[PDB]
C-alpha cells in the first residue's frame, strides 16, 4: 500500500459546505463490517463512497482509501463521530488528508 496526500476544497451546497464522500469505521464500530479493509480488525476510518463529480473525486480521493490524518489531526484511533466532526468544520474551507491506498508508472524516454 501507498501513502497519498489529498487536498479537498469544499463546495457550498446552499448553506452547507461539503466534501463529496462518505466515511465508515472508527474505534467505536465493529470492524468486521468493513468490506474495504485487508485486516478485519482494522477499526480505522475508510472512504466508503465518493460522489461522482464532487470535490473529493476531483481531488483524487478513492473508495477504500484509509484516512490517516485530517489537517494535522491523527485519525487512526478516532471514533466515527470524531472523524465526522474533523471533516465537517463549517469554519474550514479546505481539508488536507493523508490517506493510505492498497495497490507501469515508470517515465521512459527514447533517446
Ligand atoms: Cl457515530
Ligand atoms: Zn468522475
Ligand atoms: Zn486552496
Swiss-Prot record:
Record-level GO cellular component terms: actin cytoskeleton; cytoplasm; cytosol; extracellular exosome; fibrillar center; intracellular membrane-bounded organelle; plasma membrane
Tissue specificity as recorded in UniProt: Ubiquitous. Detected in brain, heart, kidney, lung, small intestine and skeletal muscle. Detected in various cell lines including HeLa. Weakly expressed in peripheral blood leukocytes.
Membrane topology category: Peripheral membrane protein
Outcome of mutating residue 23 to T: Found in a patient with dilated cardiomyopathy and septo-optic dysplasia; uncertain significance
Localization, UniProt: Cytoplasm; Nucleus; Cell membrane
Key words of the record: Acetylation, Cell membrane, Cytoplasm, Membrane, Nucleus, Phosphoprotein, Wnt signaling pathway
Effect the entry attributes to changing residue 80 to A: Abolishes interaction with KCNJ4
Residues covered by the PDZ domain: 5-102
Modification sites for Phosphoserine: 51
Primary localisation category: cytoplasm
An example Gene Ontology molecular-function term: beta-catenin binding
Any Gene Ontology biological process: Wnt signaling pathway
Function: May regulate a number of protein-protein interactions by competing for PDZ domain binding sites. Binds CTNNB1 and may thereby act as an inhibitor of the Wnt signaling pathway. Competes with LIN7A for KCNJ4 binding, and thereby promotes KCNJ4 internalization. May play a role in the Rho signaling pathway. May play a role in activation of CDC42 by the viral protein HPV16 E6.
Subunit structure: Interacts (via its PDZ domain) with GLS2. Interacts (via its PDZ domain) with RTKN (via the C-terminal region); this interaction facilitates Rho-mediated activation of the FOS serum response element (SRE). Interacts (via its PDZ domain) with CTNNB1; this interaction inhibits the transcriptional activity of CTNNB1. Interacts with HTLV-1 TAX protein. Interacts (via PDZ domain) with ARHGEF16. Interacts (via PDZ domain) with KCNJ4 (via C-terminus). Competes with LIN7A for KCNJ4 binding. Interacts with ADGRB2.
Protein name stated in the entry: Tax1-binding protein 3
Organism annotation: Homo sapiens (Human)
Gene: TAX1BP3
